[PDB]
Design a protein around this ligand. Structure first.
Ligand code: HEM
Ligand code: HEM
Ligand code: HEM
Ligand SMILES: O=C1NC(=O)c2c(NCCCc3ccc(O)cc3O)cccc21
Ligand SMILES: O=C1NC(=O)c2c(NCCCc3ccc(O)cc3O)cccc21
Ligand SMILES: O=C1NC(=O)c2c(NCCCc3ccc(O)cc3O)cccc21
Ligand SMILES: O=C1NC(=O)c2c(NCCCc3ccc(O)cc3O)cccc21
Ligand SMILES: O=C1NC(=O)c2c(NCCCc3ccc(O)cc3O)cccc21
Ligand SMILES: O=C1NC(=O)c2c(NCCCc3ccc(O)cc3O)cccc21
Ligand SMILES: O=C1NC(=O)c2c(NCCCc3ccc(O)cc3O)cccc21
Ligand SMILES: [Fe+2]
Lengths: 155, 155, 155, 155, 155, 156, 155
């Protein structure tokens, strides 16, 4: 079904954000596992898988709309060097992602692509839940202390 | 455990090949599904998942060896425009991948990194199975005709 | 609950499109069954049932909003006389239907009937899935040839 | 139990034919599998297995009759270079095999070795069933065309 | 996939050894069964089947590498005339087989055919387990006496 | 089946390292259990059992190759006096062990004893897994603090 | 709990005996398996495991009593060169072990370490059962002859 060109460009930009997130969260996951912080590693792994699922749906929608999904361009990964930095890197990435989602939804609404809007809204709900998780973890580090926070994520 | 620097470089090169394959096979899968060739779409999806699993193990090994896994650089995806071209693109990528795996195995053997060799050997077995599949599909197109071949991959 | 008069007119227009679709798809289903193309017959039957379910929800919404559902004024059926034409007739009907759904959603949004909008968005998602199916079937006929396409839908 | 010398010689000739057939059918099976024609590969594998079972019974009978089973001498394998030729090569081998079985049964009857006759009759029934299968496949190639026939044996 | 010509020669030489062993072990098995030494017969039957499985994998690999598997040439069977001789004939064949396997592995390693090497290493592990079995049986005959050794293999 | 004399010497050297590890890890396990650090005690017990299983496979291989497995000579146990030292002693032992395993594989390959090489590669994989565990534990002590690290290994 | 210095010395002497026995029985076990006397190998394996469990309890008791368990000093293994010698070597070791156990119990009794006495008594019961087994096997060799005795321990 012939999609609006600018909708497809928005979907490719959201996809590009998801492709960064997949790799950033997967590396953070495996770093935490290597450091023995296996509960963080497992949670971050599921965050990476969630972004893979979103990327799949975006690719499928782009192709239905007769666009070309862009899996070739990969933007800058934000890789931290300790647990606090890694969480902040994820949060910075997620805040960019939700800003971009809001702009894409505006445009879908304007051209009456209500099904693309509904998909992006579902993705936005997932990303806001990730922001909630990340903000909460950074808050917990302040409340229980970094050593206890890390201890609680060993097993 | 402090790994050999050139082993880590080889492992990052193999990882780079897997990251290309993940995206190339995932997009090819979703194109085939979009076109109604769901048996090809499903099989290509499982190829992409297998490359994801290989990339996971490579990332884990690099970190254990105290290297930095490179998930930032993404090489050229080879995307075809019809089924025959897509299969040939996959095959061309796999032949590059198995060349690079053989050079990495040589270097692991020379520095006595036998565990990394064993991992790469397992990955090479998977990639040669993929080559078998691909060559066979291209041969079947010649034996049964393209229309029959595509028909056989609809459902 | 007293609904907006023009919303109710839009809902009756969407209902009228669904009523056309029920009959068009049911007849196409039974034609395909009579011709021995039972997989097309079964799939087209399920498309008719899904339109019956949408019509039900639309009737229920109109009555809630204190309007009169119009089941009397049946528009023009697009009945094909061979498989490719029947698929194209369904596609043409669906493209008219999604155009009408988008205009109805615009009006629901403008008068703040957000529950009617959500119902229509759900119907639109189903209709775009039907468009995806239909475009894919027409593309398959081009890729595998008509004789093979029909063969694959006998059983 | 001391058997008739010429019976044992007949049994060793039949065994020689079965030994050719085991290897010919096994190679043809693995060629078809390599070419992606897995239904042919599997069926031909089961034909090879059946000849292995016949060879076992012949070896066992020869030994009971105080003869020496000849597993050293292997006659000429008839290997085809495409599906049609491979089937005709199997059929040519089978027609020689059933001629030899008949001449062996005649001799068993003449010297009153009715148990060896019964064994050979059972093998002959199996080989005639194989002839039926082969003649029928060659007929189907003519009726449905080679491309369809091979297509029907991919999966 | 275009294999190394000399790898294919090595694989065909190992296949030739396995084809000798299939027939030698199958005949020894059926001799032992005929003599009422059914535990030896069963064990030797399973040795024969294991060689059949190795031959299958070798044939499959050769075909994948675009070579011709040689099932026509059959080398000399070493058939014993009593239990001790049959075990020593099996051991003599196995010692030749493992020498040939080591030479094939050297060459696969030198041309970087690491998957062929892995297959041959697995077969070598199986052949060395058979050598352990055989050496052990010959040692048991010395320790418990031939009459007891045979008694222990009747049922 | 007559093995290469130097392969057998290498296999006996690997066996000797495993025999040290069996006893070192068993003692460390029972020390940690006596101190109430039962999660460390249990993990270290499983490390000792794993070395026992490797030793078994090496003994079996040496005998098949018609050598004499040396279970008489026991090298120096590296016994720590606190949790950090015990972990480092295990790590020092494993690093010597993997060095010796690599040299043994080189020689197996040279004389074409590919089955002995495969066995040693499998043991090497287990030993590198143990090194990963040990390095990670030592790093966790620095990230969470010793008191938290020990607390986290009190209970099974 | 602070133990008697001489009790701990006794426990360490008993521990030393158990450490010899672990290794002597494990080696004898694996020798019997290599020779194909698998029932002897299995039984001797279980004797070795039993000594491992005794050593564990002694280690635990020594640590509870605030002593240092000596796992460093390993006494002389008594390795036999045939089945009779191996059994007699085991028996010789066991007779030394039970003498040492009796002297240790005497001393535990004199200083009122009744729990250590109970542990040693349990170990002594196990070692006397092993003596029973060993004396009985040596007697069976005389009664049934070595060849039959070894035959009975093949499977
Ligand atoms: C274009 C980028 C990618 C896409 C669209 C994608 C998509 C997917 C999807 C749809 C799944 C299945 C999730 C489920 O339903 O359970 C999956 C699984 C997985 N992915 Fe990805 N993926 C991508 C990249 C990656 C990368 C770069 C890695 C690793 C470095 C990775 C590692 C994995 C793993 C380990 C699994 C689970 C496989 C299993 O064990 O079942 N993926 N991916
Ligand atoms: C090229 C030579 C041969 C090859 C590649 C071959 C291969 C095989 C294979 C793959 C199997 C199935 C094993 C399993 O998965 O359980 C098998 C079974 C068997 N083979 Fe062979 N074989 C060969 C020659 C022979 C010969 C010469 C004989 C007897 C004279 C024989 C007798 C048997 C028997 C009796 C079975 C078991 C069939 C059953 O009851 O399931 N094979 N063979
Ligand atoms: C300090 C010396 C040793 C101690 C304290 C010790 C202790 C133990 C214990 C407590 C068990 C568990 C038994 C059970 O409850 O099932 C065990 C198992 C075992 N041990 Fe040892 N052991 C020692 C030395 C050895 C040696 C030298 C070997 C071999 C060369 C060995 C081989 C084994 C094996 C194969 C098992 C069975 C593991 C399994 O499959 O679960 N042990 N040992
Ligand atoms: O693709 C990328 N792979 C990377 O590693 C990476 C970056 N590494 C930052 C160092 C993080 C780190 C890794 C392992 C470890 O043990 C400690 C650490 O601090 C930065 C940007 C992009 C990438
Ligand atoms: O990342 C990338 N996304 C892409 O689409 C792509 C490329 N497209 C080539 C056209 C493929 C195609 C897609 C859908 C369809 O319906 C028909 C088609 O021929 C080439 C290089 C890299 C990329
Ligand atoms: O199709 C039709 N929907 C309607 O509500 C309807 C009619 N309303 C009757 C009023 C019901 C209260 C009368 C004739 C036909 C129709
Ligand atoms: O023992 C034998 N092994 C063989 O391959 C063979 C023969 N091969 C003829 C070529 C068959 C063939 C194989 C693979 C392929 O991909 C295409 C092909 O046409 C002829 C006589 C005897 C033997
Ligand atoms: O293919 C072959 N079939 C054979 O029998 C054979 C050979 N026979 C040696 C005699 C073995 C034997 C069988 C039965 C028996 O009761 C006593 C025996 O000593 C030698 C080389 C090759 C072959
Ligand atoms: O074979 C050996 N048995 C031993 O105990 C031992 C060594 N002990 C060092 C002290 C360890 C220790 C144990 C219990 C405790 O409560 C505190 C501790 O610091 C050193 C070398 C060899 C051996
Ligand atoms: O630690 C030790 N390992 C040993 O092998 C060993 C001794 N071996 C004496 C010979 C045993 C033997 C093994 C295998 C075989 O087939 C025949 C045999 O007679 C003596 C003292 C200490 C040790
Ligand atoms: Fe007897």
């Amino acid at each position: 079904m012939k999609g609006d060109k600018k909708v497809i460009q928005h979907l490719n930009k959201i996809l590009g954000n998801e492709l960064i997130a997949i790799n950033q969260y997967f590396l953070h996951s495996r770093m935490w596992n290597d450091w023995g912080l296996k509960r963080l590693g497992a949670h971050e792994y599921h965050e990476s898988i969630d972004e893979m699922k979103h990327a799949d749906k975006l690719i499928e929608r782009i192709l239905f709309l007769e666009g070309l999904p862009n899996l070739q361009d990969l933007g800058k990964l934000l890789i931290g060097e300790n647990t606090q930095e890694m969480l902040q890197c994820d949060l910075n990435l997620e805040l960019k992602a939700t800003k971009d989602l809001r702009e894409a939804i505006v445009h879908c609404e304007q051209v009456h692509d209500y099904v693309s809007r509904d998909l992006l809204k579902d993705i936005l709900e997932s990303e806001e839940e990730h922001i909630d998780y990340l903000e909460t973890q950074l808050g917990l580090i302040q409340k229980v202390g970094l050593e206890n926070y890390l201890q609680s994520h060993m097993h």
